[PDB]
Design a protein around this ligand. Structure first.
Ligand SMILES: [Ca+2]
Lengths: 412, 209
């Protein structure tokens, strides 16, 4: 999975400015019928400027290639789009100057610690720069930006023979993109400072001749991301990626399919749903999360803690008649980003609702009525300038209610 | 292990200069109701200067290639970056004018005692000079420096064919770079007068096979 990210853009205006300076000496005489003598001298200066409306300026872009798949790509030749407002200025296929020989998974071309490469030419033989129009130049000078979109990437793969001779010529990756994408379900894991994109084969139910094995979502996740099991829970390296401990974001079709297939399922767990073709699953590991059993990474400390019972999702409730409090030092938060606070609450015996207050950019209050089963609430907030007041949150509520798996995540 | 080290850079200003010179003679006769006669002589001088803001100057680089590995590289073809402040001016791949046919370990192309090769073209056919902007040219005139960073190198290796000869076409190191780097550890030794880089294979304890 290869993408292109632009780092900065350079505008080169194309004008022809010149200057002049002269000097003239004259002499004249007259003979009336009385004589006259005339002298003259002086200096002159001139300035000029010429601008071509058709091709007013040129643009240069610095880019970085990154890979997040499971296989390397040799001879990376990506194609990029340049958009100003709704106008695609040009599409440039990478020339010989901008082809990466090797791009291993998790790596980057150019390697981390090196300057980005410059894509400033459009023709096949790297001889004609990228032009713009005068109106587009005025739009650029007005503060508008240029976005870079990647549409396709061409590369080769390696085949090893018996005696060990890698050959990467004629082994295009484009012969397998359509076939692989049409029989597989895509799963994405978005950890901090890292991202993984995977494809897992899914069985077809209408074809009696499809002998490929059947997988559930949990098994597919474990196979794809190399997760390990401790006590029935999935761990990536040390981060728990259990259903209750992360954020699952689907598209409309996958959400509808999961909802429809959850009715006939006994366990009523998303990880037990059968994986089907075309599914799109995204997992976002939380920024801060604790389960009151063995995990905690919050900068502060919970005000009220009572985890001396076998309750909650797994042996942890942390709730008495008093209300809890969190102080956010704001020292580890994005200056401009929207966050989500989520958790599970169960009300065994009917009581009053729970009132939540969050102050990060705006003061918001909501009332939730917990049920006999734990239910996610997932309220939202947002930072302002990284130099604002500490975020304080209350979970006002009585009636010996319960809590578990309270987490904070970010969104893109 | 092939790298590129720049030695100096040369700026060629893309200015146009012109000069002129003139000389004129005149005569005017007028009758009034009289007799008037006029004789005149004049000269002129002009100087000009034209500059293109889009392409203000060209640049040239003198570079060498050095090898510190254990194997030779045939047909060296490195790619370099030109950085002024944080702006990569251009990414140039070596054309046929800047290819090292042979580079034995510990050697240098060109050999020791020869002047560095000049990199001053950017297109595939070496028919186009590297341009810079007016702002970039002023930055150069303000004392700022251009740095050269190499990103990748393309080369060949030799093998015996069915007739007992040696063939270097179609054998590329890029097919093996990733495989070698994935399963090996790197060790570098820096002496007073030379540097050595090596790759040594390492065992994976989590794979029983
Ligand atoms: Ca728990």
């Amino acid at each position: 999975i290869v993408g292109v990210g632009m780092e900065k853009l350079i505008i080169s205006t194309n004008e022809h400015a010149s200057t002049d300076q002269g000097k003239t000496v004259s002499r004249a005489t007259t003979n009336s019928k009385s004589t006259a003598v005339q002298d003259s001298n002086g200096e002159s200066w001139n300035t000029g400027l010429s601008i071509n409306k058709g091709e007013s300026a040129y643009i240069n872009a610095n880019v970085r290639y990154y890979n997040t798949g499971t296989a390397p790509m040799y001879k990376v030749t990506p194609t990029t789009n340049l958009v100003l407002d709704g106008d695609t200025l040009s599409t440039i296929k990478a020339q010989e100057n901008q082809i990466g020989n090797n791009l291993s998974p998790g790596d980057t071309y150019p390697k981390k610690g090196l300057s980005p490469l410059a894509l400033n030419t459009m023709d096949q033989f790297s001889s004609r720069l990228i032009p713009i129009n005068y109106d587009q130049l005025k739009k650029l000078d007005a503060g508008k930006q240029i976005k870079l979109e990647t549409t396709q990437v061409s590369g080769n793969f390696g085949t090893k023979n018996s005696s060990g001779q890698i050959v990467t010529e004629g082994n295009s990756w484009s012969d397998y993109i359509s076939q692989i994408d049409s029989i597989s379900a895509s799963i994405i894991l978005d950890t901090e400072n890292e991202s993984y994109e995977r494809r897992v084969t899914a069985k077809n139910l209408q074809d009696p001749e499809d002998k490929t094995p059947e997988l559930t979502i949990g098994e597919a996740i474990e196979k794809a991301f190399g997760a390990t099991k401790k006590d029935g829970l999935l761990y990536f390296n040390d981060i728990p990626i259990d259903e209750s401990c992360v954020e699952l974001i689907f598209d409309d079709n996958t959400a509808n399919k999961i909802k429809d297939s959850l009715k006939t399922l006994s366990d009523k767990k998303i990880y037990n749903v059968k994986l089907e073709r075309g599914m799109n699953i995204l997992i976002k590991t939380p920024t801060y999360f604790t389960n009151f059993d063995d995990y905690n990474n919050y900068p502060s400390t919970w005000s009220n803690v009572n985890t001396t019972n076998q309750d909650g999702l797994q042996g942890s409730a942390n709730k008495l008649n008093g209300e809890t409090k969190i102080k956010i030092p704001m020292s580890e938060l994005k200056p401009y980003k929207r966050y989500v606070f989520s958790g599970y609450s169960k009300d065994p015996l009917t009581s009053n609702s729970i009132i939540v207050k969050i102050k990060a950019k705006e003061e918001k209050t909501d009332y939730l009525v917990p049920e006999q089963g734990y239910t996610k609430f997932s309220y939202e907030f947002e930072t302002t300038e990284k130099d604002s007041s500490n975020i304080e949150i209350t979970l006002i509520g009585s009636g010996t209610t319960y809590l578990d798996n309270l987490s904070i995540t970010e969104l893109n």
